[PDB]
């Protein structure tokens, strides 16, 4: 799928490949996800919380 990150449409699988492994599995285990965009948006929030405010980016 494509998801929107920081105003740009990017491949979700590529984004997932850049996600912190512990956070990605925590989010996957915690709940059902309506779609990949909801997953990404929650990941961005969790990444900022884990890494002292760092903005997840893909580039």
Q: What percent of residues adopt helix (DSSP H or I)? A: 40-55%
Number of strands: 2
Query: What is the terminal separation in angstroms?
Result: 17 Å
Hey, roughly how much beta strand do the residues contain? 5-15%
PDB class: immune system
Keywords: AcrIC5, Immune system, Inhibitor, Anti-CRISPR
Assembly: monomeric
Entry title: Anti-CRISPR protein AcrIC5
Overview of the structural elements:
This protein has helices at residues 12-18, 21-30, 36-50, and strands at 2-5, 8-11. With 59 residues, the protein is of the alpha+beta class. The chain has one domain (2-50). A two-stranded antiparallel ribbon has the order 1-2. The chain is globular, with a radius of gyration of 11 Å. The protein starts with a strand and ends in a 9-residue tail after the last helix. The PDB classes it as immune system. Keywords: AcrIC5, Immune system, Inhibitor, Anti-CRISPR. The assembly is monomeric. Anti-CRISPR protein AcrIC5.
């Amino acid at each position: 799928s494509k998801v929107t990150l920081n105003g740009q449409q990017i491949d979700f699988d590529a984004a997932v490949n850049l996600m912190d492994a512990e956070l990605r599995e925590e989010l996957h285990s915690a709940q059902e996800w309506t779609n990949d965009q909801e997953f990404l948006d929650a990941y961005v929030q969790a990444h900022a919380a884990k890494f002292d405010g760092e903005e997840f980016q893909v580039a």
